[PDB]
């Protein structure tokens, strides 16, 4: 895995801040109390959870 890399369960939400995109992450094996916002550069290996999220947002956009 590597320095502070963990498995993601799902992506819960997104937002932009300072021209940059962040995603709210639910860590696998963890609860809502550990959710963090993460910059895109942290999610290169989450293409699938990102699609599932971007998908659900289209499904009602």
């Amino acid at each position: 895995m590597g320095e502070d890399v963990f498995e993601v369960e799902k992506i819960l939400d997104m937002k932009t801040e300072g021209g940059k995109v962040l995603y709210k992450v639910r860590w696998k094996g963890y609860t809502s109390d550990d959710d963090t916002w993460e910059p895109e550069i942290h999610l290169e290996d989450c293409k699938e959870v990102l699609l599932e999220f971007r998908k659900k947002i289209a499904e009602n956009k």
Binding site: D4, V5, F6, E7, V8, V25, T36, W37, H42
Partner: peptide, 15 residues
């Protein structure tokens, strides 16, 4: 499921 979905977790943040 399908591949391993991983990411860097942030421990800091704006003060």
């Amino acid at each position: 499921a399908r591949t391993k979905q991983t990411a860097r977790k942030s421990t800091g943040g704006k003060a």
